[PDB]
Symmetry: C3
Subunit: 325 residues, 3 copies
């Protein structure tokens, strides 16, 4: 059996660990850099404001980040805000019977405005603590449904990705050389037909991830666009190609978390003709796209090959001793 185990370990190292595990290569992680450009426009027949356009280029993307990017899909717009005092929103913690309940400063922190000791009426029927803040306060209301920027589904993002492996002084780009420029003029990614088209539709991105753009885009979320560069360096540089994946990253489950979906506040400031400041507060919901790039590669190397082969010999010594037992 001594000649049998010896033929087993030789088929175990060369056959198993050197093609299946490919242990004869040195590893190297990817040094990445990405670039996005979103194209589209969206209409909205607001209740009172009437038809309105949002050019996803300028109006839709706060702000214009490096790798990742954020597409506005839904919103609650508070206007004509000015530095002033006013009534908090009706709430067990905010409600007051008189000047005694309102404490200056402390009752402030809670309702997004600083409380002055004064107690005022939120309306005729009810009364609550006065707060100085950006006024009028933001109404407490649910986001519109369907989403205003529902046209977002049909947007499209061009994703350029240059990568390099420092160790192997090798680099490549997600736009393969065998590609027409007129092709990228109107192509759009799809696993089936056009797999090399770096322009992805937003909906397709969310879809592919087993989700639904229209249900998401109401309260927001974050989509992970994973690009994987797993190349065999010893193979032709032509075989090196990006593998695109798509995940929803945040939790949809209302329980067992907080800040469901994804959203943030931002503002537009306007010097009124009176010289006084006013701002428009915007609670924007949307989908944030995180472009996550990673990978590994390796050519042949004598250092790792000899070191694995060496242990394969010592391992055949034990194996023949395991055959004796």
């Amino acid at each position: 059996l001594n000649r049998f185990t010896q033929a087993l370990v030789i088929a175990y190292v060369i056959g198993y660990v050197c093609v299946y595990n490919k242990g004869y290569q040195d590893t190297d992680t990817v040094l990445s850099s990405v670039t996005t450009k979103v194209k589209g426009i969206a209409l909205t027949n607001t209740s009172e404001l009437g038809e309105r356009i949002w050019d996803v280029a300028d109006y839709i993307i706060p702000p214009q980040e490096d790798g990742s990017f954020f597409v506005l899909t839904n919103m609650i717009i508070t206007t004509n805000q000015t530095q002033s005092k006013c009534a908090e929103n009706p709430t067990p913690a905010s409600t007051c019977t008189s000047h005694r309940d309102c404490k200056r400063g402390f009752n402030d922190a809670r309702g997004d405005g600083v409380r002055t000791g004064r107690c005022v009426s939120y309306s005729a029927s009810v009364k609550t603590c006065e707060v100085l803040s950006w006024c009028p306060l933001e109404k407490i209301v649910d986001p519109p449904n369907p989403p205003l920027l529902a046209d977002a589904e049909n947007f499209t993002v061009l994703i350029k990705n240059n990568i390099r492996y420092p160790k192997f002084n090798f680099n490549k780009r997600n736009i393969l050389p065998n590609i027409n420029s007129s092709y990228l003029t109107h192509c759009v990614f799809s696993r089936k037909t056009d797999p090399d088209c770096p322009i992805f539709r937003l909906g397709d991105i969310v879809g592919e991830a087993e989700e639904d753009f229209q249900i998401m885009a109401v309260r927001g979320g974050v989509m992970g666009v994973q690009i994987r560069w797993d190349c065999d360096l010893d193979m032709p540089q032509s075989w090196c190609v990006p593998r695109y994946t798509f995940r929803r990253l945040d939790n949809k489950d209302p329980d067992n978390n907080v800040a469901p979906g994804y959203n943030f506040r931002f503002a537009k400031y306007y010097k009124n003709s009176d010289g006084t400041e006013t701002r428009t507060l915007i609670k924007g919901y949307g989908i944030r796209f995180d472009v996550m790039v990673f990978g590994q590669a390796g050519k042949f190397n004598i250092i790792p090959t000899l070191l694995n082969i060496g242990a394969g010999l010592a391992l055949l010594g034990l194996v023949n001793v395991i055959c004796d037992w």
Copy 2:
């Protein structure tokens, strides 16, 4: 027979529990999400009581992972494209039209120099420059900080992570957690260790620093999240380890641009159609969420490899020590 019992206790006992060398390694793919909550009041000198809603007014701008909380500032207003005197400086000062060179003397004092020489005041005179005017006065930042209420702010930090190799992923919000809990919990090493909502002050504090001394001139806080999991263990044992470091140097010497700050502006189309802007030198603390980690389950490839060398190693151990 004694050395053979030593190497067996050396590999299985030492390198396979202490070094845990029977596992395959994998680095983390991370993704984070922050939301800062708070508000702050300022009784400016002249401007009087004023509110800054850390949500909208306090965070320029709203970045991905990391985020930046405005804590102090020097506000220059009513800026317009125009000419005016540079700030008094050995390089900028002039005796007459001869000292002011057009364009060149520009680069230095944050405005372009027209050949003209003008008085910065009655007693002194310096090169005229076109620029955003009036210039930003040269003054120290307020102390205490205006947005000193910042200490008491709180940041929710969500962190989803995945290990590609082991097709495994977890989130910093553990499943054994009420939603009402996260409604008002606040992190603390002692009582609530699983509360992902950290107070800013606590963050700076924990790092052995002081929010009020920092927030005056600014700095950058590293919020390190470490995911070191044993994948062969139950997926339930996989948990984030939070650390806190100040990253920038507080020492005035041996560096430049102490603390952390930047300029930004607010533009306003005047009714005359002419442009004016408000220049703001914002100081603050920038929070860098740095996520990293490693994990590994059992694997025959690495185990046999290491055991193999352990045998060859007992050959040199017994042959070389017998020679000694």
Copy 3:
């Protein structure tokens, strides 16, 4: 010749793989954090707008990102935009003979504005589909040359980089301790004279990368500022130093790609005195600087050393068999 191969593998492991490959160390990747601050100002004698200043601090850098940063170098400014209906731009797809060609909503998506069914004249000689949108449209024209913010070449960016190796509880900063503060007051990086000056001039950055700031800055691009921390931790902590590299990242070749160079749109919003909104649309071209920090380090360790030595012994066993076959 067996005593010969045994002296060969010994000189192969200790001599080759343990000094040249340094395989006796454990590896560790760098934890990084960077901070940039760009300083400069730039003038522009626009056609009609006359002399104008852009303080790279505030006016030049949309927006103020974490690691990477973006310097505005060229632009096409569309002003007095307001929500309104107006003619699309002349195009085979947009052109219309009458009300019949213009479909409400659908002909919208294409020309950056939503089409109302009505067909209007883009001018006296031609007519095209009316669209509601931010109006007037952005004229279709090529970016100015030379670039308006051509003064950008002479800007300078301070790049502060703190790094740490978690495993070895070791950390260091790209500003070495042997450095005066007055030095960094006016130093400027150069491979030759001042190699330890973390304040790089933009042009020098692009130059070093074998490119030209003035040709780039017209249509934009992205520069990779690579910082490499390759330290030997068993060596004195003083030998640990950053190596700076520079490499244009985007493709200049017009063919075999799209979105050549680098640019984006952004806007300035103004509440008109009438209460109505107006905005200034800006197609900004520029160079985006990506600070890419990476590295590896390692001290001595018995685990990896014994491992490699162990295989060197088994390797000497087969090496005896290699000279056997050579003997025939």
